[PDB]
Design an enzyme around this catalytic site. Structure first.
Site, PDB file in Angstrom:
ATOM      1  N   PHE A   1      -9.624  -6.169  16.404  1.00  0.00           N
ATOM      2  CA  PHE A   1      -8.870  -6.802  15.329  1.00  0.00           C
ATOM      3  C   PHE A   1      -8.562  -5.797  14.226  1.00  0.00           C
ATOM      4  CE2 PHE A   1      -8.898  -9.391  11.331  1.00  0.00           C
ATOM      5  CZ  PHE A   1      -7.698 -10.052  11.553  1.00  0.00           C
ATOM      6  N   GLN A   2      -7.267  -5.588  13.989  1.00  0.00           N
ATOM      7  CA  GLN A   2      -6.765  -4.641  12.985  1.00  0.00           C
ATOM      8  C   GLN A   2      -7.233  -3.206  13.225  1.00  0.00           C
ATOM      9  OE1 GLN A   2      -7.679  -6.607   9.050  1.00  0.00           O
ATOM     10  NE2 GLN A   2      -5.506  -7.187   9.233  1.00  0.00           N
TER      11      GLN A   2
ATOM     12  N   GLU B   1       0.781  -1.238   0.000  1.00  0.00           N
ATOM     13  CA  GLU B   1       0.000   0.000   0.000  1.00  0.00           C
ATOM     14  C   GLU B   1       0.817   1.296   0.000  1.00  0.00           C
ATOM     15  OE1 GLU B   1      -1.856  -3.157   2.711  1.00  0.00           O
ATOM     16  OE2 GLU B   1      -3.166  -1.496   2.126  1.00  0.00           O
TER      17      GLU B   1
ATOM     18  N   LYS C   1     -16.659  -0.043   9.179  1.00  0.00           N
ATOM     19  CA  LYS C   1     -17.278  -1.129   8.417  1.00  0.00           C
ATOM     20  C   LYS C   1     -18.809  -1.107   8.445  1.00  0.00           C
ATOM     21  CE  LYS C   1     -17.132  -6.039   7.379  1.00  0.00           C
ATOM     22  NZ  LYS C   1     -16.156  -7.049   6.852  1.00  0.00           N
TER      23      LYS C   1
ATOM     24  N   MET D   1      24.198   9.056  -1.726  1.00  0.00           N
ATOM     25  CA  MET D   1      24.078  10.354  -1.071  1.00  0.00           C
ATOM     26  C   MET D   1      24.685  10.335   0.330  1.00  0.00           C
ATOM     27  SD  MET D   1      23.312  13.426  -1.641  1.00  0.00           S
ATOM     28  CE  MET D   1      22.163  13.590  -3.001  1.00  0.00           C
TER      29      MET D   1
HETATM   30  C1  TDM Z   1      19.447   5.982   2.317  1.00  0.00           C
HETATM   31  C2  TDM Z   1      19.456   7.424   1.790  1.00  0.00           C
HETATM   32  C3  TDM Z   1      20.012   7.748   0.538  1.00  0.00           C
HETATM   33  C4  TDM Z   1      20.693   6.849  -0.498  1.00  0.00           C
HETATM   34  C5  TDM Z   1      19.772   6.416  -1.632  1.00  0.00           C
HETATM   35  O1  TDM Z   1      20.346   5.258  -2.255  1.00  0.00           O
HETATM   36  P1  TDM Z   1      20.251   5.005  -3.840  1.00  0.00           P
HETATM   37  O2  TDM Z   1      21.122   3.911  -4.338  1.00  0.00           O
HETATM   38  O3  TDM Z   1      18.725   4.666  -4.117  1.00  0.00           O
HETATM   39  O4  TDM Z   1      20.501   6.413  -4.597  1.00  0.00           O
HETATM   40  P2  TDM Z   1      21.956   7.033  -4.899  1.00  0.00           P
HETATM   41  O5  TDM Z   1      22.232   8.171  -3.789  1.00  0.00           O
HETATM   42  O6  TDM Z   1      23.071   5.901  -4.618  1.00  0.00           O
HETATM   43  O7  TDM Z   1      22.053   7.579  -6.275  1.00  0.00           O
HETATM   44  S1  TDM Z   1      19.858   9.439   0.255  1.00  0.00           S
HETATM   45  C6  TDM Z   1      19.081   9.806   1.738  1.00  0.00           C
HETATM   46  C7  TDM Z   1      18.685  11.030   2.130  1.00  0.00           C
HETATM   47  C8  TDM Z   1      18.923  12.251   1.234  1.00  0.00           C
HETATM   48  O8  TDM Z   1      17.987  11.230   3.476  1.00  0.00           O
HETATM   49  N1  TDM Z   1      18.938   8.465   2.485  1.00  0.00           N
HETATM   50  C9  TDM Z   1      18.282   8.328   3.806  1.00  0.00           C
HETATM   51  C10 TDM Z   1      16.868   7.738   3.582  1.00  0.00           C
HETATM   52  C11 TDM Z   1      16.567   6.537   4.228  1.00  0.00           C
HETATM   53  N2  TDM Z   1      15.383   5.965   4.073  1.00  0.00           N
HETATM   54  C12 TDM Z   1      14.432   6.515   3.293  1.00  0.00           C
HETATM   55  C13 TDM Z   1      13.069   5.833   3.135  1.00  0.00           C
HETATM   56  N3  TDM Z   1      14.676   7.670   2.651  1.00  0.00           N
HETATM   57  C14 TDM Z   1      15.864   8.291   2.773  1.00  0.00           C
HETATM   58  N4  TDM Z   1      16.047   9.431   2.115  1.00  0.00           N
HETATM   59  C1  TDM Z   2      -4.693  -8.733   1.991  1.00  0.00           C
HETATM   60  C2  TDM Z   2      -5.121  -9.504   3.247  1.00  0.00           C
HETATM   61  C3  TDM Z   2      -5.004 -10.905   3.328  1.00  0.00           C
HETATM   62  C4  TDM Z   2      -4.497 -11.911   2.291  1.00  0.00           C
HETATM   63  C5  TDM Z   2      -3.045 -12.327   2.502  1.00  0.00           C
HETATM   64  O1  TDM Z   2      -2.556 -12.873   1.269  1.00  0.00           O
HETATM   65  P1  TDM Z   2      -1.530 -14.111   1.231  1.00  0.00           P
HETATM   66  O2  TDM Z   2      -1.344 -14.711  -0.114  1.00  0.00           O
HETATM   67  O3  TDM Z   2      -0.155 -13.530   1.772  1.00  0.00           O
HETATM   68  O4  TDM Z   2      -1.988 -15.186   2.351  1.00  0.00           O
HETATM   69  P2  TDM Z   2      -3.143 -16.286   2.131  1.00  0.00           P
HETATM   70  O5  TDM Z   2      -4.473 -15.735   2.859  1.00  0.00           O
HETATM   71  O6  TDM Z   2      -3.520 -16.337   0.563  1.00  0.00           O
HETATM   72  O7  TDM Z   2      -2.749 -17.618   2.651  1.00  0.00           O
HETATM   73  S1  TDM Z   2      -5.568 -11.447   4.862  1.00  0.00           S
HETATM   74  C6  TDM Z   2      -5.987  -9.898   5.464  1.00  0.00           C
HETATM   75  C7  TDM Z   2      -6.511  -9.647   6.676  1.00  0.00           C
HETATM   76  C8  TDM Z   2      -6.797 -10.792   7.654  1.00  0.00           C
HETATM   77  O8  TDM Z   2      -6.832  -8.214   7.106  1.00  0.00           O
HETATM   78  N1  TDM Z   2      -5.631  -8.898   4.346  1.00  0.00           N
HETATM   79  C9  TDM Z   2      -5.805  -7.432   4.471  1.00  0.00           C
HETATM   80  C10 TDM Z   2      -4.414  -6.803   4.737  1.00  0.00           C
HETATM   81  C11 TDM Z   2      -3.963  -5.843   3.828  1.00  0.00           C
HETATM   82  N2  TDM Z   2      -2.778  -5.273   3.981  1.00  0.00           N
HETATM   83  C12 TDM Z   2      -1.971  -5.594   5.011  1.00  0.00           C
HETATM   84  C13 TDM Z   2      -0.606  -4.914   5.165  1.00  0.00           C
HETATM   85  N3  TDM Z   2      -2.361  -6.513   5.910  1.00  0.00           N
HETATM   86  C14 TDM Z   2      -3.555  -7.124   5.798  1.00  0.00           C
HETATM   87  N4  TDM Z   2      -3.888  -8.023   6.718  1.00  0.00           N
HETATM   88  C1  1MS Z   3      23.375  12.666   3.390  1.00  0.00           C
HETATM   89  C2  1MS Z   3      22.821  13.909   3.669  1.00  0.00           C
HETATM   90  C3  1MS Z   3      22.152  14.620   2.681  1.00  0.00           C
HETATM   91  C4  1MS Z   3      21.606  15.863   2.994  1.00  0.00           C
HETATM   92  N1  1MS Z   3      21.716  16.369   4.217  1.00  0.00           N
HETATM   93  C5  1MS Z   3      22.355  15.718   5.212  1.00  0.00           C
HETATM   94  N2  1MS Z   3      22.469  16.222   6.450  1.00  0.00           N
HETATM   95  C6  1MS Z   3      22.086  17.439   6.862  1.00  0.00           C
HETATM   96  O1  1MS Z   3      21.570  18.277   6.122  1.00  0.00           O
HETATM   97  N3  1MS Z   3      22.318  17.669   8.160  1.00  0.00           N
HETATM   98  S1  1MS Z   3      21.585  18.965   8.893  1.00  0.00           S
HETATM   99  O2  1MS Z   3      22.307  20.199   8.468  1.00  0.00           O
HETATM  100  O3  1MS Z   3      21.739  18.817  10.374  1.00  0.00           O
HETATM  101  C7  1MS Z   3      19.868  19.148   8.525  1.00  0.00           C
HETATM  102  C8  1MS Z   3      19.448  20.601   8.251  1.00  0.00           C
HETATM  103  C9  1MS Z   3      17.957  20.798   7.934  1.00  0.00           C
HETATM  104  C10 1MS Z   3      17.166  19.649   7.937  1.00  0.00           C
HETATM  105  C11 1MS Z   3      17.631  18.366   8.202  1.00  0.00           C
HETATM  106  C12 1MS Z   3      18.959  18.081   8.501  1.00  0.00           C
HETATM  107  N4  1MS Z   3      19.255  16.793   8.734  1.00  0.00           N
HETATM  108  O4  1MS Z   3      18.216  15.818   8.661  1.00  0.00           O
HETATM  109  O5  1MS Z   3      20.546  16.331   9.057  1.00  0.00           O
HETATM  110  N5  1MS Z   3      22.928  14.459   4.952  1.00  0.00           N
HETATM  111  C1  1MS Z   4     -11.240 -11.220   5.483  1.00  0.00           C
HETATM  112  C2  1MS Z   4     -11.604 -10.993   6.805  1.00  0.00           C
HETATM  113  C3  1MS Z   4     -10.961 -11.663   7.838  1.00  0.00           C
HETATM  114  C4  1MS Z   4     -11.348 -11.411   9.152  1.00  0.00           C
HETATM  115  N1  1MS Z   4     -12.316 -10.543   9.424  1.00  0.00           N
HETATM  116  C5  1MS Z   4     -12.971  -9.867   8.457  1.00  0.00           C
HETATM  117  N2  1MS Z   4     -13.948  -8.986   8.725  1.00  0.00           N
HETATM  118  C6  1MS Z   4     -14.489  -8.724   9.923  1.00  0.00           C
HETATM  119  O1  1MS Z   4     -14.145  -9.286  10.963  1.00  0.00           O
HETATM  120  N3  1MS Z   4     -15.447  -7.791   9.891  1.00  0.00           N
HETATM  121  S1  1MS Z   4     -15.952  -7.104  11.316  1.00  0.00           S
HETATM  122  O2  1MS Z   4     -16.830  -8.088  12.012  1.00  0.00           O
HETATM  123  O3  1MS Z   4     -16.769  -5.894  10.991  1.00  0.00           O
HETATM  124  C7  1MS Z   4     -14.649  -6.624  12.406  1.00  0.00           C
HETATM  125  C8  1MS Z   4     -14.917  -6.975  13.879  1.00  0.00           C
HETATM  126  C9  1MS Z   4     -13.805  -6.564  14.857  1.00  0.00           C
HETATM  127  C10 1MS Z   4     -12.698  -5.922  14.303  1.00  0.00           C
HETATM  128  C11 1MS Z   4     -12.540  -5.637  12.951  1.00  0.00           C
HETATM  129  C12 1MS Z   4     -13.486  -5.965  11.986  1.00  0.00           C
HETATM  130  N4  1MS Z   4     -13.190  -5.624  10.722  1.00  0.00           N
HETATM  131  O4  1MS Z   4     -11.954  -4.964  10.451  1.00  0.00           O
HETATM  132  O5  1MS Z   4     -14.036  -5.874   9.623  1.00  0.00           O
HETATM  133  N5  1MS Z   4     -12.622 -10.083   7.112  1.00  0.00           N
END
Ligand code: TDM
Ligand code: TDM
Ligand code: 1MS
Ligand code: 1MS
Ligand code: FAB
Ligand code: FAB
Ligand code: MG
Ligand code: MG
Lengths: 582, 582
Positions: free
Chosen positions: B120-121, B58, B170, B484
């Site tokens: 639940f959830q 998601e 729901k 980076m």
């Molecule tokens: C891991 C990382 C970075 C490296 C990204 O790796 P990549 O291989 O995707 O990109 P490149 O720099 O090598 O071209 S940049 C960065 C910043 C600017 O905060 N971070 C920290 C970071 C860590 N986790 C997430 C979800 N987002 C982020 N930006």
């Molecule tokens: C997609 C899904 C489910 C299917 C999971 O798919 P799988 O293929 O991984 O597992 P199976 O049931 O076919 O054996 S169960 C469920 C519940 C109980 O809320 N959901 C909704 C759901 C959607 N997204 C997340 C992150 N978690 C979840 N539990």
């Molecule tokens: C790898 C990487 C890329 C870009 N920035 C940084 N770090 C920083 O900017 N450090 S910082 O000056 O303290 C900062 C200033 C303003 C916002 C956020 C940060 N920060 O998250 O480190 N580090």
């Molecule tokens: C596919 C799947 C698996 C398990 N539960 C459900 N749905 C429900 O339980 N519906 S519900 O009764 O309204 C409910 C009761 C208590 C908590 C949460 C839910 N719900 O998220 O739908 N649906």
């Protein structure tokens, strides 16, 4: 404790925080680096006792820390940068809170002078996570780091365990200071209402109730994870049968004659029967969750309820008990065990007629599955895994049909063999969880019973498994669908498919995507199995091949998890028959 | 508008919500199904005008909706279940708020009678997302659905655009009702402070300032995305050079002689020079973010600042302006254009001496890169992509080195060709973003310039690309590192590696993981390119092959993004030379 710094010598806040972790006994963190947490990662490299397992996405990081925590009893630690790093932890925290998992999350933050200005990679994480953690902290001074970490680990592991988040501004990480390690924790309120040892006044009243009852049941949950010995002894002194919540599996050995197995919506018929007709419910370390109770007034409506919980907010929350004990179940069992040991011949307890009455239900309605020609039954695959691992594997799972079968068809001997997201029910848990489990348990068989829906969500962690050279075994029950949603679709929405098919509508018979090729991308040996005959060998090969292994198990998509109590129902509403077929 | 229901006939809340979307002009949602949102997904299937693109996680869903929104000007819509579904949206929302992206997020929730019971959830998503969305809603009655959706889309798209979340229990989805579509929106406060058209009193004072200045600069940002024509005409009537924020790329064509390109920390030297020495700063649709300003007192310290913004909370937040206009920049430009058109000969504007002074800086310090033997320069790859696509591709990116080069070396003609996470800077954005872009723009070339760190985070969406048969082209700049972070490591931490290497320490020269095999797992054609000579052809093949394509581009890991102003610095601190090499 030996420091790497002189007692009179200043060092960075980042270096204080790492030492604070070392002083807590931390040996592993799961940390992904970024701008606002670089300093911590720099301090980490100069530690010799803490190893860092780098995930590929920080949700992997958190679930890995949960795996670590759940499979060991130690707290799991994860670290992330500010902004996007921090927000990617959110599902893990929410998961850890609902399942009562001890977790310490550390996030970097923008420098203090910029908090609130929507700075580069800024997120008010303390604000965001307030309702989904046990507690959290914004560190506003380098002087506070020793105290906050100590408080964080204490709160995370004491009482009802849970996640605690510590947000650490970049300038604090850089500020030089001399740490003071003898500060008093500022938790006067929390510490004053920490439950006392249970006194015999309460405990003898429970033993009194046991001896007066004819149909007693043990309703056992995640609160009992550290009381397997105590509960074991308790059963052998009373002969009371044991139903279990999903979170409590393994507390009492599933492969014992006194075990009623799991109760609840996908619980066994005999377990739900026992509880339905019991006159005394012994609810130890449970939270009367809707999945097990169903419609509340009908749940154990003829039962005298005894409820022991470490959280007072849980006692009388959903079902109001007759008798209650507030505190540690381990101690309550220890106390009750002595009373039962002393007055053994004085009581002469015999629940034969009730245990027998349950034994006929266990035969009239046992756990069952259909085998269709040469196709693999998912249930049977888990049975073979159980037999071959000798019931001694650590099992993690995703969420859905496969999760219920892994619960139903594997026989857990000890607790902390079963790792699964119960409260939140988060998909993409099984794989990163397995990583944590294996790092915490380097000599145990670790198997992730995953579904194709869940597996793909955090497939990037296969990079982690390989690079970290961990022997994670993946038993992928591939049914091309979001099965759990599909089952409900079949029984409530006239089988009308609403975005539950995971394969390719163009090539509708081809297995998609090719999970073996994901494994190959990360240099992990992999095999696919389709015929039931090849299963016993395929699984054996998975277990025997050193290092990581993925086994793609193809299953007919129209299998249903049974039994089933429709949501908000009663024991009379139990569904025991049917599937998505003809 | 034709309904699928009789005006007097009751239907489910789920069916009302979908119609509410149809009535807003929604044609695409990005929705992942679960327990608490099933009903919505059921209602979705019986709609003929809204298509659902199912992601594999998601977070993919949200970033896809952002891609959709950013590349079209329409709002992006995503739907998720309760609990884990909902929390997985969190990074996307935070991203959309910081970058001002119109988004409507709908989440299922537990039935109302269970809100607060840790069901639940269950997750208090309204609580969690309050500080990271423009606004949010908990729907407590089926009667409120028409009004809340209308309010949600209005708030999301009006004023400063942003994310709005609607949580739907729901039982509300199941409740039968007759919708009323003529309800008044309950937004009296928000609606009363919606900015008025700008009057000429303010606008003639700006034209007055232009004619009085010798060294004017246009500081242009994400606020100008809908004013490309107006800004175009404004420039041709004044001859004022245009610097741009990362979020504003393409507002003014990068390949024009009046373009100073990007300013800021990784901005061009001449752009930062212009701003440093300007006497009049025309800041249109910007937010004076720390990445462009650096140390605040030094930023345009000799400049008369004019600031036009649709958000009053932004005016005087970081730098206090001399002159300010509160409202839509499109209208302000339209007004200023007439004044300049009428008094053209009366003013006889000529900024030749200043434009010329900048032209020597553009030559003394142009954007540059080194070529090492036969190895591919990442910069050069992006230049070839630019040449071959004729500058007309929609480009999405991850975060880091590759993001800056995609900004620096591609020449965007129109706005909404450049999709990138600027404010939050979230990794794993480029790929799902590309999906949204392509679904919104079925006939355009869509290329995701991604890094191996970022790409892997949401690699599961390759399943989505293939199944949805979308022509997403992926140009993966593979340098085996979190670049980076590595760059900062090289320049501030004595090149001490702190968990920045993404390959396998055992086989340290082998490219890991094998990105071609991820693509093959999802049946997506893929090729790898290592020699610079093969690049022109490899890219051409990517473009020519119908459907999705992945090109793994191997790059030396020690390249540095230049120029660079160290964080919290000045124009004097600018770094123009060096890399991670010898
Ligand atoms: C891991 C990382 C970075 C490296 C990204 O790796 P990549 O291989 O995707 O990109 P490149 O720099 O090598 O071209 S940049 C960065 C910043 C600017 O905060 N971070 C920290 C970071 C860590 N986790 C997430 C979800 N987002 C982020 N930006
Ligand atoms: C997609 C899904 C489910 C299917 C999971 O798919 P799988 O293929 O991984 O597992 P199976 O049931 O076919 O054996 S169960 C469920 C519940 C109980 O809320 N959901 C909704 C759901 C959607 N997204 C997340 C992150 N978690 C979840 N539990
Ligand atoms: C790898 C990487 C890329 C870009 N920035 C940084 N770090 C920083 O900017 N450090 S910082 O000056 O303290 C900062 C200033 C303003 C916002 C956020 C940060 N920060 O998250 O480190 N580090
Ligand atoms: C596919 C799947 C698996 C398990 N539960 C459900 N749905 C429900 O339980 N519906 S519900 O009764 O309204 C409910 C009761 C208590 C908590 C949460 C839910 N719900 O998220 O739908 N649906
Ligand atoms: C994802 C999913 C989950 C399902 C599910 C289907 C799906 C698809 N269906 C079922 C089902 O059919 N059956 C089922 O059982 N679960 C099911 N669940 C999970 C269910 O929602 C929930 O997780 C569990 O029922 C809760 O486990 P618990 O009751 O042990 O509480 P749990 O969450 O483990 O909490 C433990 C309780 O014990 C307390 N506690 C902790 N430590 C101590 C201590 N030391 N001493 C005394 N008290 C302590 C603590 O305060 C808490 O109240
Ligand atoms: C991830 C990353 C990002 C970097 C980065 C490096 C990395 C690794 N380095 C740079 C860099 O070197 N240079 C750079 O520029 N960015 C950089 N950024 C991004 C930077 O943090 C930030 O996203 C932008 O500078 C902000 O863009 P903006 O100033 O256009 O505001 P933006 O976020 O686009 O907001 C637009 C402003 O315009 C306002 N607005 C919206 N619509 C209107 C309207 N219709 N009329 C008048 N006002 C309106 C709105 O209220 C807001 O104040
Ligand atoms: Mg499945
Ligand atoms: Mg890289």
């Amino acid at each position: 404790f030996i420091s790497r710094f002189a007692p009179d010598q200043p060092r960075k806040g980042a270096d204080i925080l790492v030492e604070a972790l070392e002083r807590q006994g931390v040996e592993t963190v799961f940390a992904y680096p970024g701008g606002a947490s670089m300093e911590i990662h720099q301090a980490l490299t100069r530690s010799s006792s803490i190893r860092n397992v780098l995930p590929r996405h920080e949700q992997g990081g958190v679930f890995a820390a949960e795996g670590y925590a759940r499979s060991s009893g130690k707290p799991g630690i994860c670290i992330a940068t500010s902004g996007p790093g921090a927000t990617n932890l959110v599902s893990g925290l929410a998961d850890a809170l609902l399942d009562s998992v001890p977790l310490v999350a550390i996030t970097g933050q923008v420098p203090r002078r910029m908090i609130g200005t929507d700075a580069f990679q800024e997120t008010p994480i303390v604000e965001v996570t307030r309702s989904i953690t046990k507690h959290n902290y914004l560190v506003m001074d380098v002087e506070d780091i020793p105290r906050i970490i100590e408080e964080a680990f204490f709160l995370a592991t004491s009482g009802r365990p849970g996640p605690v988040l510590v947000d650490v501004p970049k300038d604090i990480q850089q500020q030089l200071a001399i740490p003071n390690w003898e500060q008093a924790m500022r938790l006067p309120g929390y510490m004053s209402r920490m439950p006392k040892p249970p006194e015999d006044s309460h405990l003898e009243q429970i033993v009194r109730l046991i001896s007066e009852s004819k149909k007693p049941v043990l309703y056992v949950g995640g609160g009992c994870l550290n009381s397997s010995d105590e509960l074991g002894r308790f059963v052998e002194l009373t002969g009371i049968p044991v139903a279990t919540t999903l979170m409590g599996l393994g507390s009492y050995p599933c492969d014992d004659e006194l075990s009623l197995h799991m109760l609840g919506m996908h619980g066994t018929v005999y377990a739900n029967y026992a509880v339905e007709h019991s006159d005394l419910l012994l609810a130890f370390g449970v939270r009367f969750d809707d999945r097990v109770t169903g419609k509340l007034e009908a749940f154990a409506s003829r039962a005298k309820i005894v409820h022991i919980d470490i959280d007072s907010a849980e006692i009388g929350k959903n079902k109001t008990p007759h008798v209650s004990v507030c505190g540690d179940v381990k101690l309550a069992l220890q106390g009750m065990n002595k009373v039962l040991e002393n007055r053994a011949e004085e009581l002469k307890l015999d629940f034969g007629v009730w245990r027998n009455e349950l034994n006929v239900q266990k035969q009239k309605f046992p756990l069952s599955f259909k085998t269709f020609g040469e196709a693999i039954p998912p249930q049977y695959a888990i049975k073979v895994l159980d037999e071959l691992t000798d019931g001694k594997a650590i099992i993690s799972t995703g969420v859905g049909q496969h999760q219920m079968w892994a619960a139903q068809f594997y026989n857990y001997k000890k607790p902390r063999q079963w790792l699964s997201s119960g409260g939140l029910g988060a998909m993409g848990f099984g794989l990163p969880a397995a990583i944590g489990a294996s790092v915490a348990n380097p000599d145990a068989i670790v198997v992730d019973i995953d579904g194709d829906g869940s597996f793909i969500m955090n497939v990037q962690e296969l990079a982690t498994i390989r690079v970290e050279n961990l022997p994670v075994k993946v038993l992928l029950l591939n049914n091309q669908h979001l099965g759990m949603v599909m089952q409900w679709e079949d029984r409530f929405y006239k089988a009308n498919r609403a975005h539950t098919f995971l394969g390719d509508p163009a090539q509708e018979d081809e297995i998609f995507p090719n999970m073996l090729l994901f494994a190959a991308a990360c240099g992990i040996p992999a095999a696919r199995v389709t015929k039931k005959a090849d299963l016993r060998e395929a699984i054996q090969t998975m277990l025997d091949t050193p290092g990581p292994y993925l086994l793609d198990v193809i299953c007919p998509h129209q299998e249903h998890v049974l039994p089933m109590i429709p949501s908000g129902g009663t024991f009379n509403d139990v569904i025991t028959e049917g599937d998505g077929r003809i």
